[PDB]
JSON list of C-alpha atoms in Angstrom, two decimals:
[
{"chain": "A", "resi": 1, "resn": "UNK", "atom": "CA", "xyz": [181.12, 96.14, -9.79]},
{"chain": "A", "resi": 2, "resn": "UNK", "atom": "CA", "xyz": [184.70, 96.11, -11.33]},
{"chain": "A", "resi": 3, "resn": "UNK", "atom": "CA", "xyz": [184.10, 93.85, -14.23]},
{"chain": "A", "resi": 4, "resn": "UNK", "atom": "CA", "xyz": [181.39, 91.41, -13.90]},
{"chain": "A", "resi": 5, "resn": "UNK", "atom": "CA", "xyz": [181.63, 90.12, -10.07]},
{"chain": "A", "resi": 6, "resn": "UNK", "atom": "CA", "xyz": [183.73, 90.60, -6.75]},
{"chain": "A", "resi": 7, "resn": "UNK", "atom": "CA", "xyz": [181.91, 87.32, -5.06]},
{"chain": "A", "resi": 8, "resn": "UNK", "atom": "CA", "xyz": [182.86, 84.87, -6.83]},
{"chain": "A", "resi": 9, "resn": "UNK", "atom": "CA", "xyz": [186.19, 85.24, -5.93]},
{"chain": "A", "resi": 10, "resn": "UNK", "atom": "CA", "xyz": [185.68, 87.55, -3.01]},
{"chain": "A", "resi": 11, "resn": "UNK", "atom": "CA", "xyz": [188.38, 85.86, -1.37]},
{"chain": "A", "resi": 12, "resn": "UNK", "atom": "CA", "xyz": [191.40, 86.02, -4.03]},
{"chain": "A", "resi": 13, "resn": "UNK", "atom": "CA", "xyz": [190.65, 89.82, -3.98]},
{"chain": "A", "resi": 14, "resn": "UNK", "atom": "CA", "xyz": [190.24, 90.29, -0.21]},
{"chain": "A", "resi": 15, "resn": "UNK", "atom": "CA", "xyz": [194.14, 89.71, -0.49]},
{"chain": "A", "resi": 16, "resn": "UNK", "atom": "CA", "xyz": [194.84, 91.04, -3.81]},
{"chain": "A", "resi": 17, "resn": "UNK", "atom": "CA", "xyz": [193.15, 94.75, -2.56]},
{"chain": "A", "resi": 18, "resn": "UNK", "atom": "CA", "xyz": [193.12, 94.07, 0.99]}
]
């Protein structure tokens, strides 16, 4: 929804935005 996708890296965001 930000960009292009929150999945495939789901993970290095969980931490990056909690």
């Amino acid at each position: 929804h930000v960009f292009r996708l929150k999945k495939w890296i789901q993970k290095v965001i969980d931490q990056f935005g909690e």
